[PDB]
Amino acid sequence: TTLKQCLAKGGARTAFPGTSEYSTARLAYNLRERYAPSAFVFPTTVAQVQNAVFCAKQVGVGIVPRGGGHSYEDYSLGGRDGVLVVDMEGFKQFSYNKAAKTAVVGAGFRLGPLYLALWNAGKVTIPAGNCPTVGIAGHALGGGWGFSSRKFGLVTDNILEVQLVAANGTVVTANAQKNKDLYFAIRGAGATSYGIVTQFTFRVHDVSAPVTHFKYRWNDKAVLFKNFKSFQSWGLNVPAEISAAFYMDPSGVSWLEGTYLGKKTSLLPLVKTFLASAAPNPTRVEEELNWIQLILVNWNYPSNTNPNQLNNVPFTTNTFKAKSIYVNGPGLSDAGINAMINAMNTGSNAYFIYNLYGSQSAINKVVPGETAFIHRNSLYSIQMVASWSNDNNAVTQTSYITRYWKVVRTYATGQAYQNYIDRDMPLSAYYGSSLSTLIAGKKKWDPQNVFNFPQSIPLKHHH
Ligand SMILES: *Cc1cc2c(nc3c(=O)[nH]c(=O)nc-3n2C[C@H](O)[C@H](O)[C@H](O)COP(=O)(O)OP(=O)(O)OC[C@H]2O[C@@H](n3cnc4c(N)ncnc43)[C@H](O)[C@@H]2O)c(*)c1C
Numbered sequence: 047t048t049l050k051q052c053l054a055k056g057g058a059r060t061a062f063p064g065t066s067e068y069s070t071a072r073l074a075y076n077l078r079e080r081y082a083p084s085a086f087v088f089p090t091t092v093a094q095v096q097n098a099v100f101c102a103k104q105v106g107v108g109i110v111p112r113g114g115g116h117s118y119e120d121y122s123l124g125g126r127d128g129v130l131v132v133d134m135e136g137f138k139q140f141s142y143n144k145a146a147k148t149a150v151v152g153a154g155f156r157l158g159p160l161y162l163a164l165w166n167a168g169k170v171t172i173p174a175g176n177c178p179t180v181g182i183a184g185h186a187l188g189g190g191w192g193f194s195s196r197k198f199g200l201v202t203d204n205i206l207e208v209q210l211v212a213a214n215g216t217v218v219t220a221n222a223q224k225n226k227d228l229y230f231a232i233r234g235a236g237a238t239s240y241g242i243v244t245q246f247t248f249r250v251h252d253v254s255a256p257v258t259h260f261k262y263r264w265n266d267k268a269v270l271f272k273n274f275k276s277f278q279s280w281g282l283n284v285p286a287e288i289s290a291a292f293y294m295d296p297s298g299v300s301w302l303e304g305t306y307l308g309k310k311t312s313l314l315p316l317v318k319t320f321l322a323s324a325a326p327n328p329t330r331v332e333e334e335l336n337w338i339q340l341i342l343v344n345w346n347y348p349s350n351t352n353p354n355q356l357n358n359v360p361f362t363t364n365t366f367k368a369k370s371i372y373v374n375g376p377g378l379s380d381a382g383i384n385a386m387i388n389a390m391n392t393g394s395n396a397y398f399i400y401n402l403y404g405s406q407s408a409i410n411k412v413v414p415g416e417t418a419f420i421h422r423n424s425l426y427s428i429q430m431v432a433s434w435s436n437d438n439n440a441v442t443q444t445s446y447i448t449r450y451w452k453v454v455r456t457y458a459t460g461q462a463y464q465n466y467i468d469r470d471m472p473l474s475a476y477y478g479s480s481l482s483t484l485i486a487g488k489k490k491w492d493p494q495n496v497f498n499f500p501q502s503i504p505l506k507h508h509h
């Protein structure tokens with residue numbers, strides 16, 4: 047019996063190659079690897095997820111879940127041709143528990159709509175990232191850094207419980223009590239490798255007080271060293287109420303952007319040392335806002351935008367290779383900063399973003415060894431993106447950003463951030479001391495390797 051016949055038993059919506067539904071379902075954030083699946087199935091019930099998992103095993107196809115489809119390597123199209131893509135768009139269950147300070151979120155949510163629901167429900171939030179069309183699922187299962195993460199932790203740090211459909215078909219629950227091993231794995235390594243998460247339960251945080259958004263911007267190739275060095279010096283001492291990111295690109299633009307959980311009249315003592323050592327005359331934007339306005343501004347909407355825009359943020363696409371790396375305190379040496387900028391200036395149509403972690407952050411304050419997310423001792427991460435619009439430049443752009451990664455590598459660590467997924471990183475760079483444990487759990491929960499992609503947790507232990 048065929049896959050059409052098998053999935054038809056479950057009754058979920060499907061799309062199969064050659065139809066227009068299948069064509070539009072192929073949309074992904076990165077258009078570089080246009081993998082062609084066997085089929086798309088759109089579950090709205092746990093039963094139907096169980097059907098897809100059963101049918102893929104019977105027909106002998108691969109199977110990956112897809113949330114918001116932002117995977118930098120197109121792994122939610124399978125990372126290879128011929129997979130069954132289980133698009134979880136139909137799982138939008140929401141509920142807020144004010145007394146418990148928790149919320150239930152279905153694995154189909156995007157960050158934009160999720161922020162709106164949590165704001166309307168109780169002026170709360172989770173510390174998610176700032177791209178509104180990103181799915182909560184991949185985001186949360188790989189970490190998740192946003193502009194309140196230095197106060198409230200990573201998204202993954204706020205997973206209190208998940209429910210997933212495992213490889214043998216059973217609905218499972220994982221939290222600090224039930225199935226602690228699976229619960230460890232999904233907080234940092236949950237993408238695909240252990241089954242299809244159907245819902246999350248998050249710890250939520252009060253954001254009803256005013257907050258303050260700041261951004262200091264320059265357009266001058268000559269002040270890049272000075273601005274980045276000042277960012278590093280300042281970043282070592284930033285209190286947890288601030289989450290900031292630095293930006294830089296080969297056209298000469300650079301900026302510091304951040305969110306302060308506090309009143310604007312308190313902000314300037316906290317950014318004084320950065321501005322004092324950066325170059326003179328930054329473009330200066332400092333703005334007191336409420337939380338749902340902050341979400342809008344962090345995605346370039348005017349703060350007077352209707353909050354309901356967060357339900358209809360247009361999905362945009364790009365074609366790119368991305369890499370990442372972690373840098374430890376006190377940061378790059380001065381020689382490293384010049385090597386980085388010189389390497390950046392050998393090319394174009396790229397950008398570079400530095401998310402601040404640091405010893406004051408809730409991220410670095412987790413006890414190590416309790417989550418699959420290991421990067422608990424860095425000053426900042428580097429996101430390295432090189433784009434193209436014509437495949438002629440694919441090889442030169444891919445070589446450019448890989449040269450850049452190797453230059454920075456001399457002055458930094460070998461660890462990378464798994465939500466900036468990179469097929470050329472060894473898994474030890476993402477999972478390190480916890481990878482043995484991850485493989486043990488993979489053996490236990492999917493011995494047949496039903497759920498795999500080019501960088502799924504393997505079944506063989508390193509010797
Ligand atoms: C496109 C995009 C990505 C961003 C952006 N900004 C970020 C930010 O501000 N902070 C961050 O920490 N990261 C940012 N990123 C990267 C994203 O965090 C990652 O790209 C996330 O992994 C995206 O998640 P999602 O949209 O759900 O992408 P998918 O491609 O669908 O999934 C990725 C990965 O996870 C597996 N998976 C999805 N769904 C499930 C379920 N339900 N159960 C198990 N596993 C699941 C997929 O199979 C795949 O392997 C800004 C922008 C614009």
Ligand SMILES: *[C@@H]1O[C@H](CO)[C@@H](O)[C@H](O)[C@H]1NC(C)=O
Nearest residue numbers: 212213214215216217490491
């Ligand atoms: C699937 O495996 C888990 C743990 O191995 C077990 O608890 C569950 O009952 C299994 N379901 C089956 C065999 O249908």
